[PDB]
């Protein structure tokens, strides 16, 4: 199988390498005979002649147009007739594009900036990640001491783990005694140790979580330090730091490094994004998390080294863990859009998109839209928009479908042939009529975007069939992937038409899309009020919830499917309502903010959980009890009482210590935080230990009873003594309690106010100590 390509020059000639995976052995495929081109639309054919002898300088090179031939394709809905420009190198192109330009008889050039590398990929129908070929991978991740007033990577890396099928490692220079640790003499030789490793286990795949931004970069700036040499591509190579947006990417040549990070921050969202918060959400099984302080304290101490050596050794593990289940996803993307998993995993939707349209459009003799410049990218993202929502019914309900639209706006842009190409086209015989916005787009021809979702669409229906009808559940595994990575590319093309970088944009395309779609949904709503009686609570361009009022759990569930096949039956084309689950219980509270109970006791809630950095057991434990009052108990007052008790217990110290270690990642070194807050105090507390932290990284404190404001008295966690030390109870409540249940509550009608008890030492700044929202 295909793992990557790029390309090498070799005398101005350029030369593409394909790094494949074949029956266990790595090889490097060469084609010297692969050609750069672009297109160019001129007023009249003869100024090809013209053309062809334009040239322009490159390091004192003269850059010539090699070939032309004029050729058939089709733009805009339209048939086209350009020439194909040839060149000796891809770099050549842009030398070359500007003078080009400038000729008066050339319309403009097509197909300039498409990266040579993938050109070849598109080109020559080539498909990465196929075939059976099983890949050899390996985790890695690094443990460094910070210093404040320095430069980048100054601070040594003490611990370099990785993790494998044999297992898991942790290669230091510190004096630790564990099965799994090989000790070494220096931070030099660890590393060398680690290169030494990796060369020999010789792994298709390099896993880490955010080493585009971390482990590499440190990796690399400390063997400049020390006097390394870097090696860890397969040919040779230093690994490449790459401009990927604002930040970085890292490349190894021969190799693939899945960096976990971006894929995990597009697939399930979270408030911070730790390791442990990761292996929390898709495993369901506890961290074991050990703070940024302990460890800075076994760096000059020595004490609880083993634990930190544990813990490095966790890293490892659950990198490699979290890589065996995203890689095969991100191997079936990288397969459906036609480019490198390398590219695919940091690719934006939208981006995906276009490489899949890319290759799409070379089969179909498609010519491509250009990118916009500085002018038109202004232009285009100085856009907003609103949304749709059905304010909800306040209070608790029962016996609540929830019934969403299968796919609806990829349904929207088939059904009504949405498209750039098809947009308010001249002496069209058929159109139908966005509404809002009035584009009239035209069913004459199919548009080359609604034909290819089309086959998207039902090319995952067959996947889908087919992983019903497998029994071999490696065969099914993998079927679920192949539907699930349509399902992403699908759902992105509604985005794709808005995004500000897509060739073929159509913010009226977009609009159109977006205006179909609350017409559906309002006409379903309308239609389910009139003629079945239900009550809608709750609305989104995500589905609605509904219920009959004084109908058990079944008359519901009958009635909600009878209605899908009445409004199916007068939906347009592919629009098509479901039944996506029911709920016993449920409450609503604003646009993107409930709770719901379904039968097998489980809780789902959306926009209402904590998100705040700074959060604490004695908030989440808090908060999960007043929810599970109203929906598992069905009820509200208990709730209230809950509240009330939680924070009593606060007043009078009785709260267990340990529930109320407030975990922030920090966005900047403490001994610059806000002048206010716990911050400041936990950083002279640590200096006092010789400790500093490394912004990014999560801190435990307790906040404590002081002489100042309050809020501003904090100490690390492991400092904290039931006795000389006692914690700020209205930190606890106005801070961090009452905010988690607050909002919930006041959806059933409490105040603040309502949720301590009459006089419980009472001090009036809850204004004051609420987080700004
Ligand atoms: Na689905």
Not at 170 to 178: F, G, H
Not at 379 to 385: I, L, V
Not at 549 to 561: F, L
Request: aromatic share 12%; charged share 35%; hydrophobic share 35%.
């Amino acid at each position: 199988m295909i793992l990557d390509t790029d390309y090498i020059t070799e005398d101005g000639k350029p030369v593409i390498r394909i790094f494949k995976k074949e029956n266990g052995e790595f090889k490097i495929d060469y084609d010297r005979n692969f050609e750069p081109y672009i297109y160019a639309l001129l007023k009249d054919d003869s100024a090809i002649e013209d053309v062809k002898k334009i040239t322009a300088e490159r390091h004192g090179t003269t850059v010539r147009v090699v070939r032309a031939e004029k050729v058939k394709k089709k733009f805009l809905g339209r048939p086209i007739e350009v020439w194909k420009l040839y060149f000796t190198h891809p770099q050549d192109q842009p030398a070359i594009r500007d003078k080009i330009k400038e000729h008066p008889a050339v319309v403009d050039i097509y197909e300039y900036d498409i990266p040579f590398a993938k050109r070849y990929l598109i080109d020559k129908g080539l498909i990465p990640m196929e075939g059976d070929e099983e890949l050899k991978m390996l985790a890695f991740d690094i443990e460094t001491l910070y210093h404040e007033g320095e430069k980048f990577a100054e601070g040594p890396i003490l611990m370099i783990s990785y993790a494998d099928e044999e297992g898991a490692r942790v290669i230091t220079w510190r004096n630790i005694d564990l099965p799994y640790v090989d000790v070494v003499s220096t931070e030099k030789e660890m590393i060398k140790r680690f290169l030494k490793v990796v060369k020999e286990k010789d792994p298709d795949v390099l896993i880490t979580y955010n080493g585009d931004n971390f482990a590499f970069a440190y990796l690399k700036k400390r063997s400049e330090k020390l006097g390394v040499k870097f090696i860890l591509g397969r040919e040779g190579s230093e690994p490449k730091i790459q401009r990927m947006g604002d930040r970085f990417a890292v490349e190894v040549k021969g190799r693939i490094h899945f960096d976990l990070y971006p894929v995990i921050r597009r697939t399930i969202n979270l408030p911070t994004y730790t390791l442990e918060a990761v292996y929390e959400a898709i495993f369901g099984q506890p961290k074991e998390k050990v703070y940024a302080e302990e460890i800075a304290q076994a760096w000059e101490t020595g004490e609880g080294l083993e634990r930190v050596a544990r813990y490095s050794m966790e890293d490892a593990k659950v990198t490699y863990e979290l890589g065996k289940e995203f890689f095969p996803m991100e191997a079936q993307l990288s397969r459906l859009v036609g480019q490198s998993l390398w590219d695919v995993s940091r690719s934006s939707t939208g981006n995906l998109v276009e490489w899949f349209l890319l290759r799409k459009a070379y089969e179909r003799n498609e010519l491509a839209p250009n990118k916009p410049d500085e002018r038109e990218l202004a232009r285009r993202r100085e856009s907003y928009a609103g949304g749709y929502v059905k304010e909800p019914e306040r209070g608790l309900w029962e016996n609540i479908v929830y019934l969403d639209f299968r796919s609806l706006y990829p349904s929207i842009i088939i059904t009504h042939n949405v498209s750039p190409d098809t947009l308010n086209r001249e002496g069209c015989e058929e159109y139908d009529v966005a509404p809002q916005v009035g584009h009239k787009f035209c069913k004459d021809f199919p548009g080359f975007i609604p034909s290819l979702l089309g086959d998207l669409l039902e090319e995952r229906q067959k996947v889908k069939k087919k992983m019903k009808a497998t029994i071999d559940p490696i065969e099914k595994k993998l079927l679920d992937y192949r539907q699930r990575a349509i399902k992403i590319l699908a759902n992105s093309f509604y985005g794709y038409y808005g995004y500000a970088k897509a060739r073929w944009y159509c913010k009226e395309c977009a609009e159109s899309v977006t205006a179909w779609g609350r017409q559906y949904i309002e006409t379903t709503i309308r239609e389910i009020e009139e003629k079945f009686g239900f009550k809608v609570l709750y609305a989104d361009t995500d589905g609605f919830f509904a219920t009959i009022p004084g109908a058990d759990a079944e008359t519901v569930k009958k009635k909600a499917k009878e209605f899908l096949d009445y409004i199916n039956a007068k939906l347009p084309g592919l629009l098509e309502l479901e039944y996506e689950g029911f709920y016993k219980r449920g409450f609503f509270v604003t646009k993107k903010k409930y709770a719901v109970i379904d039968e097998e006791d489980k809780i789902t809630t959306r926009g209402l959980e904590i998100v705040r950095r700074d959060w604490s057991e004695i908030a989440k434990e808090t908060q999960a009890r007043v929810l599970e009052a109203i929906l598992k108990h069905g009820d509200v007052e208990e709730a209230v009482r809950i509240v009330k008790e939680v924070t009593e217990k606060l007043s009078k110290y009785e709260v267990p210590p340990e529930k109320l270690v407030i975990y922030e990642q920090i966005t900047r070194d403490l001994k610059d935080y806000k002048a206010t807050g716990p911050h400041v105090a936990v950083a002279k507390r640590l200096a006092a230990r010789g400790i500093k932290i490394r912004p990014g990284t999560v801190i435990s404190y307790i906040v404590l009873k002081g002489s100042g404001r309050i809020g501003d008295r904090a100490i690390p966690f492991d400092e904290f003594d039931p006795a000389k030390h006692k914690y700020d109870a209205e930190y606890y409540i106005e801070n961090q309690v009452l905010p988690a249940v607050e909002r919930i509550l006041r959806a059933f009608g409490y105040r603040k106010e309502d949720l301590r008890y009459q006089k419980t030492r009472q001090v009036g700044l809850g204004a004051w100590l609420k987080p700004k929202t």
